[PDB]
Design a protein around this ligand. Sequence first.
Ligand code: CL
Ligand code: ZN
Length: 258
Amino acid sequence: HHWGYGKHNGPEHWHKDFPIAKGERQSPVDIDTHTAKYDPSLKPLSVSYDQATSLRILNNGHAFNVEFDDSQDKAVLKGGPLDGTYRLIQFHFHWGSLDGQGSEHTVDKKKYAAELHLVHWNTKYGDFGKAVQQPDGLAVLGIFLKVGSAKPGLQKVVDVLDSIKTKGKSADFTNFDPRGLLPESLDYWTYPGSLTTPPLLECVTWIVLKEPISVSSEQVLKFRKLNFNGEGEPEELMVDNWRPAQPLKNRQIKASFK
Ligand SMILES: [Cl-]
Ligand SMILES: [Zn+2]
């Protein structure tokens, strides 16, 4: 009986094994666009993904992760609210059973169809496992997906999902370029928060982009065909793997734009 997204193991049960679920800096949250403070001291984000090396894609039973070689400074995020260099280690998505839910973060209570998380750890700490222990250890870039037009650069991702259908499966996934997932503008809101899965550590600077990307209905449909189970236990579709909004408590959301 370990954690998941169902009735008996879902986000509302998490606090029993992971008490920090009820903490002071839990994510995700609702971004109230009228209460967010424009802060003109924030610099533009600097995203340097030219030398990125993708290695592998896996179904870990809660999402699918595309993993990158983080042994050197090859795909890095700097600037913004960040001091220092943060290395890309993985990206993953959260998505819904239907097009009107799926994102974790909300914008004036509006849900998007999915949310992309690009996970970066602060090189000052030397590896990811030490990073998650620090208040400034991680930076995740969150990008919202709405359904409209196809995103061509997501297509290579969708075509291999057939090969990692069940929990535990993994496939070689080289030469994928994460630039094809970025929207046009890099304006953002930022606030201090947490991982949105267990262990829910409060180690994250969140950078949530204003501009959504578009994917097609057919594209998100293929995400929905994945399984939370291993081969073949009874089939449970991997859908609605999102944690709802958590209390903002004593936190300010800052915007890079007005
Ligand atoms: Cl993970
Ligand atoms: Zn995530």
